[PDB]
A and B are shown apart, each in its own frame.
Chain A
Amino acid sequence: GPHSMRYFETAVSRPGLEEPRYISVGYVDNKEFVRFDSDAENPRYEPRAPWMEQEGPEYWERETQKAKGQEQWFRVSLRNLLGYYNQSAGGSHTLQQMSGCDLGSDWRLLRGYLQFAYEGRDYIALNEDLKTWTAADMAAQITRRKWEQSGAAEHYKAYLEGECVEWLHRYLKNGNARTDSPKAHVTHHPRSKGEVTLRCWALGFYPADITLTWQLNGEELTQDMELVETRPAGDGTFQKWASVVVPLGKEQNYTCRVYHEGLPEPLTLRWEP
């Protein structure tokens, strides 16, 4: 199937120079694989998955050096942004970046990403063409004009089309040691007399994406249905449930459906006493 790599980078300032804290996290196929954190005693890129321990000390030293440069870039940018937004000294501020690439099942580049956020809000983003920039804010225009003149987009295009794809191909070869299908069941819960709660659980699944539906007649009952956001069990898998209020006795009339990419086809089930 398809593959991806991402680097999520953050710098956070707090009042009191001291310098900002810089954290970099790498992901391959939406799973953390490397991590740098400037708060560490001896700041380094560290492996975060067993398959990454293959890499020798030359890798870790190269990447650590890059992280130190990125840390400085974030410092300077954070300071520039304070001026752009006429923010005074005395506050907390956040600068974030997402960079990386999507590959198809054929391992060809499908899309490059290069986005920034300030205070948790979109600041500037390289468009899918990898040539032009989207910048909402009036302040972000200063940046966009600068980066048009500096040829920033071509620089990042080169990394996204080259190094990103190259390195992702490498990491995909190094990592051989999936989907986990959900296991669903309905639980019976009492409610205000006459009514009951049927709650459909999905457990043990990976990736997190899943849909739960209740039907009568049927006729999906989105209106009054209750659910929770998909949550990590903590073991690498996810949980979710959906529930509905139902007249007592007439519970065999309602059916829960579970849609997941790991399934050969959707699961259909109901309460079994």
Chain B
Amino acid sequence: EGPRNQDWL
């Protein structure tokens, strides 16, 4: 399973 990204760039 892939990551869930946190804050945006």
Contact = CB atoms under 8 A, between A and B. Distances in A.
Task: Please tell me whether chains A and B touch each other in their complex, using a CB distance cut-off of 8 A.
Answer: yes
Interface of A: 7, 9, 24, 26, 62-63, 66-67, 69-70, 73, 76-77, 80-81, 84, 95, 97, 99, 114, 116, 123-124, 143, 146-147, 150-152, 155-156, 159-160, 163-164, 167
B1 A80 contact: no
Given A70-B5, A97-B5, 13 more contacts: A62-B1, A63-B2, A66-B4, A67-B2, A69-B4, A70-B2, A70-B4, A95-B9, A114-B3, A123-B9, A146-B7, A152-B6, A167-B1
Q: Is the interface of B mostly helix, strand, loop or mixed?
A: loop
A24 B6 contact: no
Which of A73, A80, A116, A150 neighbours the largest number of chain B CB atoms within 10 Å of its CB?
A73
Q: Is the interface of A mostly helix, strand, loop or mixed?
A: helix
Contacts of B4: 66, 69-70, 159
A210 to B, nearest CB: 31
A115 to B, nearest CB: 12
Contacts of B5: 70, 73, 97
- Nearest first, the 5 closest Cβ-Cβ pairs linking A and B are A77-B9, A7-B2, A150-B7, A155-B6, A152-B6
B2 A24 contact: yes
Contacts of B3: 7, 99, 114, 156, 159-160, 164
Nearest to B5: A73
A77 B2 contact: no
B8 to A, nearest CB: 5
A77 B5 CA distance: 11
Nearest to B2: A7
Contacts of A156: 3, 6
Nearest to A67: B2
20 contacts: A7-B2, A9-B2, A24-B2, A62-B1, A63-B2, A70-B2, A70-B4, A76-B8, A77-B8, A80-B9, A84-B9, A99-B3, A114-B3, A147-B7, A155-B6, A156-B3, A160-B3, A163-B1, A164-B1, A164-B3
Contacts of A24: 2
Which of B1, B5, B9 neighbours the largest number of chain A CB atoms within 10 Å of its CB?
B9
Contact of B2 (A80, A95, A99): A99
A66 B3 CA distance: 9
Nearest to A45: B2
